[PDB]
Amino acid sequence: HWGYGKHNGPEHWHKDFPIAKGERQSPVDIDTHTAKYDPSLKPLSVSYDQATSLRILNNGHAFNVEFDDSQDKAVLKGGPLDGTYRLIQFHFHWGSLDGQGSEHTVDKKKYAAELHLVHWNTKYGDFGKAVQQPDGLAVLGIFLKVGSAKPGLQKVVDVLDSIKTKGKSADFTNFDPRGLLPESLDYWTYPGSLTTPPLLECVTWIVLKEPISVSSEQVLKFRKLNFNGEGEPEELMVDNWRPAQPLKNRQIKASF
Ligand SMILES: CC1(C)CC(NC(=S)Nc2ccc(S(N)(=O)=O)cc2Cl)CC(C)(C)N1O
Ligand SMILES: [Hg+2]
Ligand SMILES: [Zn+2]
């Protein structure tokens, strides 16, 4: 099945998922001099105070911190969005080295990693229905660079030991995602897709301009995770990022 290696990676995905070569694929390069400020954008509203995390899972591609979305608690609204989008999970994409790891790029610059906070449109009742809609998902993307530690990331870092291999999960309650956010909510936005198979074109991307800093020791622990399952040969979970895809005349709008 699909992965990030030479024989199952992003170059191969189109065979099982033809939409890989579609009209609104993600990620993309954000060309800052082509992106236009949009006065019609309303302020972005990220309300994570009432968020309820349940557990963390190694799914053999990345790790997901999953949230209880059976009530309107952690919500993303405003900006380019119409209505209310509920937080369901977050995960990261990262590299084997600090010079790569992000999926979106900024004037071709690759960051050390990228956080995706995934939200579904409440008008569609549940996540599975939303991913069948052009405006079913909103993903908040945040770049990570290596420098000072991110205190609010440490609880995640410390639990990775318990989920080394594919299929492992651990209880992960009372994690506050507010501690992963940069100061500024300045962002670029474009219509796109999931960056993993099934690559569905259901996402409004909201990519923050300001990166968060994480320590070298924090990212190093990300790189200790395994793609493989328990008792299998060790395949380090690194470079789990899809490269930039063709923009195809889409317009990236800036909030600033
Ligand atoms: C839609 C559902 C229920 C979950 C899907 N899981 C997804 S779409 N995981 C996922 C994969 C990639 C992203 S990303 N990188 O675009 O933020 C975000 C998410 Cl939630 C997989 C499929 C569509 C087969 N089923 O199981
Ligand atoms: Hg869709
Ligand atoms: Zn992602």
User: Which residue among 14, 61, 104, 119 is the active-site one?
Assistant: 61
Q: How far apart are CA 121 and CA 109, in angstroms?
A: 31
Q: Would you call 219 exposed, middle or buried from its count of C-beta atoms within 10 A (0-12, 13-18, 19+)?
A: buried
Structure token digits, residue 230: 């328990």
Q: How many domains does the chain have?
A: 1
Structure token digits, residue 228: 């493989």
Q: How far apart are CA 37 and CA 10, in angstroms?
A: 32
Q: How far apart are CA 73 and CA 222, in angstroms?
A: 28
Q: How far apart are CA 198 and CA 24, in angstroms?
A: 13
From atom 4 of ligand 1, which residue's Cα is the shortest distance away? 128
Structure token digits, residue 115: 């956080």
Q: How far apart are CA 81 and CA 110, in angstroms?
A: 27
Label the pairing between strands 253-254 and 203-208: unpaired
- Which residue ranges are tagged as binding site for Zn(2+)? 91, 93, 116
From atom 8 of ligand 1, which residue's Cα is the shortest distance away? 194
Q: Which residues have any ligand 1 atom within 6 Å of their CB?
A: 89, 116, 118, 127-128, 131, 139, 194-196, 198
Segment (H or E) for 67 = strand 63-67
Experimental determination approach used: X-ray
Q: Which domain covers residue 84, as residue numbers?
A: 1-256
Q: What is the resolution of this structure in A?
A: 1.9
For residue 104, report the distance from its CA to the centre of ligand 3, in Å: 10
Q: Give SS3 for 57.
A: strand
Structure token digits, residue 133: 């809609």
Q: What is the CATH number for 142?
A: 3.10.200.10
